[PDB]
Amino acid sequence: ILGNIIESSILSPNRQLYGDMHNVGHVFLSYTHDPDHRHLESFGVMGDVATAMRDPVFYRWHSFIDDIFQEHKIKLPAYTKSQLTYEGISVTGIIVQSEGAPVNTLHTYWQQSDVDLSRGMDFVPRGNVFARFTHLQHAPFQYVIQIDNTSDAQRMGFVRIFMAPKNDERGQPMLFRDQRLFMVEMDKFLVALRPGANRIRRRSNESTVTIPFERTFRCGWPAHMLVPKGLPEGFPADLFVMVSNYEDDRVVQYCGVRDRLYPDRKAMGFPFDRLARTGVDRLSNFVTPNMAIQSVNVIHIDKTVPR
C-alpha cells in the first residue's frame, strides 16, 4: 500500500491526500536552474528515469524515501525464533571459490565491451559503429553450502543469500540494527534436500537477482555489477545464507516468463526487513541453525581484462 501511496501509482488509495511524493520530487530537483520557465530550458537529468541514476542527488532523495518506508517496517513485530527456524534443517557452512584464487575471496576489475550504436546514429554514413565501454566486472565464482536434513523425508527449502559489509568505521563487527539495512540480495532459489547430508553448489551466473550480459548489450540487475568493487587491500564482508521452509513460502499459481505473481509469500528482503527479536544484537547471534555466516574478502585490481 505504502509503496503505491509514495510516488503515487493510480493504485494509491487516496492520491489527492497523500499526493505524488516521489515523482514530484524528481521534477523539483531537475528544475532548480529554471523553475518558472523564464529561461526556456528543459529539465536536468533527474527528470528522466532513463538518466536519473547518473545524478548523486538521486541516492539522497531515494535514501529519504527509504527512511519513510523504514518507519513502517520498524513498527512490524520482530520475527520470532520460531518463525525463522526450519525444524530439522541445519546449515553448517557456506564458502565461495573462484578459479585461481583462495577460498572465500571475490575479485573485481575493469573490462571493455563493445556495442553497435549504428541503428541510433541518424544521418551518419551507413556501416558499423562499435563503441568500447569500460565497466566493473567480477571473476566467476560459486557458492558451496553444507545442509543437514535429520528428518527422514525430502525437505523443500528456499536458499536466500545476502551480503553486507562486515565492520563499522571503528573496526568492530557491525550491529544488526545497522547491518540489516546494508544486506544486498545475491541469490534466491529452490532446493530439494535428501535425508542426511547435502552439498549444494550454485554458480554466480545462476543468480536470480541478475540477467546475462547478452540481454543488456546484445527486468534484471546487470551481471557484472553483482559483486561490489571492494578495495585493492581487500574489503571485509559477511556472506549470509538462510534456508526457509518452502512449503510456507510457496505460492500456488530472469525467472521464466514474467506476467504472473511474485513467487514468494515472505516479505521482500525477508530475513532482514524487520527489527531484531529481544536479546539479538549482531548477526552472529541473530542466526538460527538453518542459517550460516561466512567472512568474505573482496579484492579489486585496477586492470582492464578482455572478454
The annotated binding site is made up of: 22, 26, 62
Nearest in space to 243 (alpha carbons), one of 145, 160, 177, 140: 160
Torsions phi, psi of 72, nearest 5? -85, -45
Longest dimension (CA), the chain: 75
Torsion angle in degrees (nearest 10) through CA of 222, 163, 190, 200:
110
Nearest in space to 161 (alpha carbons), one of 184, 139, 178: 184
Q: Within a 10 A sphere around the Cβ of 178, how many other Cβ atoms? A: 12
DSSP string, 67-87: HHHHHHHTTSPPPPTTTT--T
Cβ atoms 295, 104 nearer than 8 A: yes
Residues annotated as binding site for Cu(2+)?
A: 22, 26, 62
Cβ atoms 141, 204 nearer than 8 A: yes
State in Å, rounded, how far the first CA of the chain is from the last one. Answer: 44
CA distance 146 to 149: 10
Q: Indicate which residue of 7, 99, 169, 206 is catalytic.
A: 7
- Catalytic residue check, 7: yes
- Catalytically active residues are 7
